Amino acid sequence: RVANLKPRISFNFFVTAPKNVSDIIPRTEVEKAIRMSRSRINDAFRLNDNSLEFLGIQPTLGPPNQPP
Amino acid sequence: LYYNTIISWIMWYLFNSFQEPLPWSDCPLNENQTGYVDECARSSPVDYFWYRETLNISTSISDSGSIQWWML
Ligand SMILES: *[C@@H]1O[C@H](CO)[C@@H](O[C@@H]2O[C@H](CO)[C@@H](O)[C@H](O)[C@H]2NC(C)=O)[C@H](O)[C@H]1NC(C)=O
Ligand SMILES: *[C@@H]1O[C@H](CO)[C@@H](O)[C@H](O)[C@H]1NC(C)=O
Ligand SMILES: *[C@@H]1O[C@H](CO)[C@@H](O)[C@H](O)[C@H]1NC(C)=O
């Protein structure tokens, strides 16, 4: 369910159960689902993690241990 | 005597070339890989490569430490 659409290109969204409008999925579980498939949503729109931000979900991992 | 230490510093930056991400281009991670090192974020990464990864500088001229092998 999408609300508050703007020209800058911003909106809010929340996720409900498939045919139960009273059952809103909690936000901390939608944050875990987006973290699992963030690289797959970025490739579908040709954006890369700084031009598609989620405002409360920040990218974490990745050690730069280059030289052997 | 001291102009041969400036050339000692210059050829340290020459050995740390020949790699495409240069070592003074980005901040290192600390222990848990979640945030940067604290003084690399308040200062600049280049300003961090000189005072902590080349010189390992102290806070005064009174406080001195070991010989700092790489420089030697
Ligand atoms: C739709 O989802 C709501 C949850 O928001 C379900 O409501 C629960 O219903 C059970 C028994 O019917 C209660 O014990 C729970 O306390 C209710 N939850 C809340 C938060 O009050 C509702 O049953 C769902 N409807 C269908 C058809 O599955
Ligand atoms: C940061 O690393 C320390 C260990 O060096 C650890 O105890 C701490 O939990 C870590 N912080 C986070 C937010 O992971
Ligand atoms: C110099 O570097 C060593 C590790 O290479 C570190 O243990 C030491 O604390 C550093 N000196 C100062 C004054 O921070």
| B8, B71 contact by CB (below 8 A) | yes
**Closest approach of B29 to chain A, Cα-based (Å):** 7
Strand boundaries in A1-68, DSSP class E: 2-3, 12-13, 16-17, 20-24
Q: Which residues of B touch A57 (CB under 8 A)?
A: none
3-state helix vs strand vs coil in chain B, percent to 5: 35, 5, 60
Nearest CA to ligand 2 atom 5: B31
A62:B33 CB<8 A: yes
Q: Which residues of A touch B21 (CB under 8 A)?
A: 66
Q: Among all chains, which residue has been given the structure tokens 């500088």?
A: B57
Task: Give the three-class secondary structure for A3.
Answer: strand
What is the residue type of B35? G
- H or E segment at A19? none
Residue B16: name the closest of B48, B59, B49, B64 by CA: B49
Rounded Cα gap, residues B63 and B25, in angstroms: 29
| B17, B25 contact by CB (below 8 A) | no
Q: Among all chains, which residue has been given the structure tokens 């700092």?
A: B68
Residue B33 has which token pair?
A: 């890989």
Q: Residue A25 carries which DSSP code?
A: P
- Output the furthest CA–CA distance in chain B (Å, rounded): 44
Rounded Cα gap, residues B28 and A14, in angstroms: 36
Beta carbons within 8 Å of B26's beta carbon, 6+ residues apart: A64, B45
Q: Which residues of B touch A65 (CB under 8 A)?
A: none
Task: Give the three-class secondary structure for A40.
Answer: helix
Residue A57 has which token pair?
A: 């979900």
Query: What does this entry list as its resolution, in Å?
Result: 2.9
A23 φ, ψ to 5°?
-105, 90
DSSP secondary structure, B24-57, as one string: TSSPPB-SSSSSB-HHHHHS-HHHHHHHTTTS--
**Closest approach of A4 to chain B, Cα-based (Å):** 32
Rounded Cα gap, residues A45 and A48, in angstroms: 9
Cα-to-chain-centroid distance, residue B23 = 9
Q: How far is CA B5 from CA B12, B38, B40, B51, in A?
A: 11, 29, 26, 16
Nearest CA to ligand 2 atom 1: B32
| A5, A11 contact by CB (below 8 A) | yes
